[PDB]
């Protein structure tokens, strides 16, 4: 009842996934973005492209960033004018991995427009984004929120966290633990390993006990198989230990787990690991 | 046909065993446990030799390494057993210890398997745990019938890699449950609400059964033993001990039996393994 014209700026990792499900629900789509065989899948599935972003935006009842970082959401909201040029009463849902001390940033400048801001990021890799069984992240007022909640709804189970910058803290938290349970499953696997054991049975073996995690049956899986190939490069698991622990110094708080991780990724990233995915940290951890 | 349990999860794991159709023989040092096995049929011995005497399988649930070494060698178990016989060792013991008890039984003619078991009370009279065996594949297949009824067995390997695959699961849990404790605090002083993060976690690339089980004990600050905090860091420190006679570098792992250290110190030896909580937690005020 909020909203018909969707806009995406970027389309990320999972973007194209994403606006098949949102076409396939009757929204119309405008995008704006960067790459040429994307923009033409896109085209193909009846979103409308433009060359700048502020046009995409314009008529766009919810503009939804896929974007990379906190630099380019500022540069292309306020340098390329898409704040400006936004209706009254529409909402901008930010899906970048963004800082929490971002994402309040960008809701006060939206909000002194008369615009919207929720911070939406989301778990759940390609398969949630083609299943719509994908994990969302929000954070900022309810009535804005429940407003989102229909287009949210196509994507995945959505949960509201809190006020603006909850999503993206949320989000912090799920990589944190992620950034762990990858290594303590790349170590236990390279200790069963060492001892004899054969990785595939290993994990045959504790598959369904307290051992069981997302992280052992997806990256472990890849582990198993040498699969490095980049889905999630290790060089963004790098950035969210390093914004993790940026939010942890300004909020005051202690993380000696995830102090650890960001040195062994820093690592990784030095020795050129940068562009295997994230499993990829197994292979800092065999060579030591 | 004829099990035997020396020690008791063995209460509900009896349970089961007893439905199933198999005899029953225990060996046990508390009374009320032996209480609840004489109610289900089970006949409890004075000895554990004579528990022993006449099973196709006995069923170590003992302590530790020191513990099954005392039952099988000095109270003669080991020479009471019978001539086609198999022991399965679900006790806590390093792959170093199963290896010499292997052997030591094998030149007595008994065969060995370690089968130690990751899962909870709720998987033990639920039949769901998770069996991890090391031992020759004709035992093995002798023995799966039985390890059927307690939940799904996997072969890994040779003695001694039954253990070696419970410290890599115990590695796992325990590492897991500090990222998990250590997620939720970074969150709550962040403003955001335990419950809340845990239900926006749940179902994407972050969840395990560790957040699901553990995890809600956090959220409730329900920290009361199931298995102790205690054990937890004996586990690290087995795996650090392995990990050496292996030549293994686990400075995960490391890192962890450090914080698991702090913990036990600092009076949290009785709480449960998700107790680690409570450490992250003061560290931070």
Same mark, same amino acid.
């Given at each position: 009842?909020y909203?018909?014209?969707?806009?995406?700026?970027?389309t990320?990792?999972?973007?194209?996934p994403?606006?098949?499900?949102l076409?396939?629900?009757?929204?119309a789509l405008?995008?704006?973005?960067?790459?040429?065989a994307?923009a033409?899948?896109?085209?193909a599935?009846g979103?409308?492209?433009?060359?700048?972003?502020?046009?995409?935006?314009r008529?766009?009842?919810?503009?939804?960033?896929?974007?990379?970082n906190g630099?380019?959401?500022?540069d292309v909201?306020?340098?390329?004018?898409?704040?400006?040029?936004?209706?009254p009463?529409s909402?901008?849902l930010?899906?970048?991995?963004?800082?929490?001390?971002?994402?309040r940033?960008?809701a006060a400048?939206?909000?002194?427009?008369?615009?919207?801001?929720?911070?939406?990021?989301?778990?759940?890799?390609?398969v949630?984004a083609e !299943?719509?069984?994908?994990?969302?992240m929000?954070?900022?007022?309810? @009535?804005?929120?429940? *407003?989102?909640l229909?287009? $949210? &709804?196509?994507?995945?189970?959505?949960?509201?966290?809190?006020?603006?910058?909850?999503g993206?803290?949320?989000?912090?938290?799920?990589?944190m633990i992620?950034?762990?349970?990858?290594?303590?499953?790349?170590?236990?696997?390279?200790?069963?390993?060492?001892?004899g054991?054969d990785?595939?049975?290993?994990?045959?073996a504790?598959?369904?006990?307290?051992?069981?995690s997302?992280?052992l !049956?997806?990256?472990?899986?890849?582990?198993?198989e040498?699969?490095? @190939?980049?889905?999630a *490069?290790?060089?963004?698991? $790098? &950035?969210?230990?390093?914004?993790?622990?940026?939010?942890?110094?300004?909020?005051?708080?202690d993380?000696?787990?995830t102090?650890?991780?960001?040195?062994?990724?820093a690592?990784?990233?030095e020795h050129?690991?940068?562009?295997l995915?994230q499993?990829?940290?197994?292979?800092?951890?065999?060579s030591?």
């Amino acid at each position: 009842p909020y909203a018909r014209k969707i806009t995406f700026l970027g389309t990320g990792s999972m973007g194209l996934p994403m606006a098949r499900r949102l076409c396939e629900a009757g929204y119309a789509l405008q995008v704006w973005n960067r790459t040429p065989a994307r923009a033409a899948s896109l085209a193909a599935l009846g979103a409308t492209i433009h060359e700048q972003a502020r046009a995409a935006a314009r008529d766009a009842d919810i503009v939804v960033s896929m974007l990379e970082n906190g630099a380019v959401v500022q540069d292309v909201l306020f340098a390329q004018g898409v704040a400006a040029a936004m209706k009254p009463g529409s909402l901008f849902l930010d899906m970048a991995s963004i800082t929490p001390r971002e994402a309040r940033d960008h809701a006060a400048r939206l909000g002194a427009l008369g615009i919207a801001h929720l911070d939406t990021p989301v778990s759940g890799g390609t398969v949630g984004a083609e !299943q719509g069984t994908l994990v969302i992240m929000a954070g900022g007022k309810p @009535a804005d929120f429940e *407003r989102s909640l229909p287009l $949210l &709804k196509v994507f995945g189970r959505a949960t509201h966290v809190g006020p603006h910058g909850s999503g993206q803290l949320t989000k912090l938290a799920n990589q944190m633990i992620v950034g762990i349970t990858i290594g303590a499953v790349a170590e236990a696997l390279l200790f069963a390993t060492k001892g004899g054991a054969d990785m595939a049975k290993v994990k045959e073996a504790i598959t369904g006990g307290f051992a069981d995690s997302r992280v052992l !049956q997806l990256h472990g899986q890849r582990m198993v198989e040498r699969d490095f @190939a980049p889905r999630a *490069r290790l060089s963004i698991q $790098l &950035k969210d230990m390093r914004n993790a622990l940026a939010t942890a110094q300004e909020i005051g708080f202690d993380a000696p787990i995830t102090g650890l991780f960001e040195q062994l990724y820093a690592e990784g990233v030095e020795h050129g690991l940068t562009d295997l995915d994230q499993s990829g940290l197994f292979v800092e951890l065999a060579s030591r």
